[PDB]
Amino acid sequence: RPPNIVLIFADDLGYGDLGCYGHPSSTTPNLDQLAAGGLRFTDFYVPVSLSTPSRAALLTGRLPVRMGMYPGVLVPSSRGGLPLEEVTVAEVLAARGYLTGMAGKWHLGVGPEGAFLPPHQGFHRFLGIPYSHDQGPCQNLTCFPPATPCDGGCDQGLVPIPLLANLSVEAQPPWLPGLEARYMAFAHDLMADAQRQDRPFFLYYASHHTHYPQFSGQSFAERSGRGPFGDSLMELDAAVGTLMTAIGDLGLLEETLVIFTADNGPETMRMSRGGCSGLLRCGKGTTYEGGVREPALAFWPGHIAPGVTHELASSLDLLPTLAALAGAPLPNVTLDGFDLSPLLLGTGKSPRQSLFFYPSYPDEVRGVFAVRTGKYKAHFFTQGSAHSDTTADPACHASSSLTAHEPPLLYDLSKDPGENYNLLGGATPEVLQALKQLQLLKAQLDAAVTFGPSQVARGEDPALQICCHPGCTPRPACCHCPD
């Protein structure tokens, strides 16, 4: 019998946000304990620094550019979404007799009759928002009780964010200070049912947590010490705790594999209400460490030895890793990941020796922007980001345009993870030997990988906006059904 997999996927969390990762004020008790009793990756990456592509790669285990999950992210009125031909981790496990279930943010397309929603991609049960919770007007919405409004107002001219239970709207807009509660409930039931069915569950908890606007329940409002972002993180931390408790009460501790990560770097344009990359450079939207290197914590008593690994690993490896643990047959499609089970089980090292990064807006001409092999990371193309704005380092700002590099900026991450000192900026046979390998790795991938038809380029059709009242007037303002 395979393990009970629980894959938590935080939204917009930085490398230096968790308490166990070095943040001064952040309050993350449950996660620190999870990290104290299980593996803690120091070098865990994501292929792209954005929600849509990152999430796409997590579920399919393939590079975003293959399935056309570019450029940028999907909006509510988008026509495209994650192709059904693409097999997700949920589909692979479902066939293995798993009771799959998702709670929260999808952001992988909605389409016509909801053809791109979770139920069609492999999940049995679902409860959550089809996209980023800020992609809908939030002027009237309350982020913190009793009646503290959400700052910014979010995206205007759009239908209020709906809370989809499978394929039907349960609320619109859902009460944010209590949205989290519904997810934990949905989780507990999913696990309980799976237990009394003698069936292994797969809980994909994609939290809206630490993505803007920052929201929380009365139990966390001004209770973190780190303000709005802190309160929102404290809730995410509690959510992990309640899940661990629920699993504990069911006696499934040594029979449950828990994984935690974030989809991309901190949106620093959010300032005091945004994440923190820590020592890493820049954040969301950039190919710098601060935008692609996300935290990670493996937990599974009796199988996962408590420690800290520096082995190379990516979210692209989760599908094969989880498939291997479940004994589930791997798909025919060419996966860009590896089986990290040896690393987790402590029976060997990670197969990951090289990493490839693509920008927010990629293209077949330039190709991969950054490539890492061992401790060396080359930067063939550097670019700033609006998401990485307001910081002290000008290399992150949107002002910094796309610049080419020949030879590429070579960084020894083992001694310079902050990417401040370029080696080629001037050599050493070791460095020179690495340069050649990195330049070849790029060329070999660019030639092999072929960009799939851009889904985001399919266009926007406002008629696709999920409305609570079908055939309503005047849309979209008339689509309501609060709690």
Ligand X SMILES: *[C@@H]1O[C@H](CO)[C@@H](O[C@@H]2O[C@H](CO)[C@@H](O)[C@H](O)[C@H]2NC(C)=O)[C@H](O)[C@H]1NC(C)=O
Ligand Y SMILES: *[C@H]1O[C@H](CO)[C@@H](O)[C@H](O)[C@H]1NC(C)=O
Examine residue 165 and tell whether it contacts ligand X (CB under 6 A).
Answer: yes
Examine residue 427 and tell whether it contacts a copy of itself (CB under 8 A).
Answer: no
Examine residue 140 and tell whether it contacts ligand Y (CB under 6 A).
Answer: yes
Examine residue 399 and tell whether it contacts ligand Y (CB under 6 A).
Answer: no
Nearer to ligand Y (CB atom), residue 156 or residue 450: 156
Nearer to ligand X (CB atom), residue 127 or residue 191: 127
Residues 180-219 that bind ligand X (CB under 6 A): 186
Examine residue 412 and tell whether it contacts a copy of itself (CB under 8 A).
Answer: yes
Q: Which stretch binds a copy of itself (CB under 8 A): 21-29, 67-75, 110-118, 213-221?
A: 21-29
Examine residue 139 and tell whether it contacts ligand Y (CB under 6 A).
Answer: yes
Residue 309, binding choice from ligand X, Ca ion, ligand Y, none, Cβ under 5 to 8 Å by partner class:
none
Residue 176 backbone dihedrals phi, psi, to 5 degrees: -60, -45
Closest CA to 123 of 145, 146, 157, 98: 98
Q: Token pair of 244, please?
A: 């661990």
Q: Which residue is nearest to Ca ion (CB)?
A: 51
Residues 253-272 that bind Ca ion (CB under 5 A): 263-264
Examine residue 130 and tell whether it contacts ligand Y (CB under 6 A).
Answer: no
Q: How many whole angstroms from its chain centre is CA 373?
A: 23
> Cβ of residue 145: shortest distance to ligand Y, in angstroms?
17
Examine residue 478 and tell whether it contacts ligand Y (CB under 6 A).
Answer: no
Nearer to a copy of itself (CB atom), residue 21 or residue 338: 21
Examine residue 421 and tell whether it contacts a copy of itself (CB under 8 A).
Answer: yes
Examine residue 32 and tell whether it contacts Ca ion (CB under 5 A).
Answer: no
Exactly one of 40, 66, 105, 124 binds ligand X (CB under 6 A); that residue is 124
Closest CA to 46 of 417, 314, 311, 313: 314
| Interaction mask 48-67, Ca ion, x per CB under 5 A | ---x----------------
Residue with tokens 């917009």: 12
| Interaction mask 207-246, Ca ion, x per CB under 5 A | ----------------------------------------
Q: Which residue is nearest to ligand Y (CB)?
A: 140
Nearer to Ca ion (CB atom), residue 36 or residue 271: 271
> Cβ of residue 438: shortest distance to a copy of itself, in angstroms?
19
Examine residue 281 and tell whether it contacts a copy of itself (CB under 8 A).
Answer: yes
Nearer to ligand Y (CB atom), residue 140 or residue 272: 140
Q: Token pair of 227, please?
A: 């303000």
Q: Which residue is nearest to ligand X (CB)?
A: 165
Q: How many residues bind ligand X (CB under 6 A)?
A: 7
Cα angle for residues 339, 81, 172 (degrees, 5° grid): 110
Residue 165, binding choice from ligand X, ligand Y, Ca ion, none, Cβ under 5 to 8 Å by partner class:
ligand X
Q: Which stretch binds ligand Y (CB under 6 A): 10-18, 134-142, 221-229, 432-440?
A: 134-142
Q: Token pair of 295, please?
A: 């935290």
The 3-state secondary structure of the chain reads CCCEEEEEEECCCCCCCCHHHCCCCCCCHHHHHHHHCCCEECCEECCCCCHHHHHHHHHHCCCCCCCCCCCCCCCCCECCECCCCCCCHHHHHHHCCCEEEEEECCCCECCCCCCCCHHHHCCCEEEECCCCCCCCCCCCCEEECCCEECCCCCCCCCCCCCEEECCEEEEECCCHHHHHHHHHHHHHHHHHHHHCCCCCEEEEEECCCCCCCCCCCCCCCCCCCCHHHHHHHHHHHHHHHHHHHHHHHCCCCCCEEEEEEECCCCCHHHHHHCCCCCCCCCCCCCCCHHHHECCEEEECCCCCCCCEECCCEEHHHHHHHHHHHHCCCCCCCCCCCCCCHHHHHCCCCCCCCEEEECCCCCCCCCCCCEEEECCEEEEEEECCCCCCCCCCCCCCCCCCCCEEEEEEEEEECCCCCCCCCCCCCCCCHHHHHHHHHHHHHHHHHHHHCCCCCCHHHHCECHHHCCCCCCCCCCCCCCCCECC
> Cβ of residue 128: shortest distance to ligand Y, in angstroms?
23
Q: Which stretch binds ligand X (CB under 6 A): 65-73, 120-128, 247-255, 377-385?
A: 120-128
> Cβ of residue 458: shortest distance to ligand Y, in angstroms?
28
Q: Token pair of 71, please?
A: 């450029």
Q: Cα torsion for 323, 329, 334, 335, to the nearest 10°?
A: 0
Residues 352-391 that bind a copy of itself (CB under 8 A): 390-391
Exactly one of 80, 111, 137, 217 binds ligand Y (CB under 6 A); that residue is 137
Examine residue 360 and tell whether it contacts Ca ion (CB under 5 A).
Answer: no
Residues that bind a copy of itself (CB under 8 A): 16, 19, 21-25, 36, 42-43, 225-227, 229-230, 271-272, 276-279, 281, 308, 310, 390-395, 412-418, 420-421
Residues that bind Ca ion (CB under 5 A): 11-12, 51, 263-264
Residues that bind ligand X (CB under 6 A): 124-127, 165-166, 186
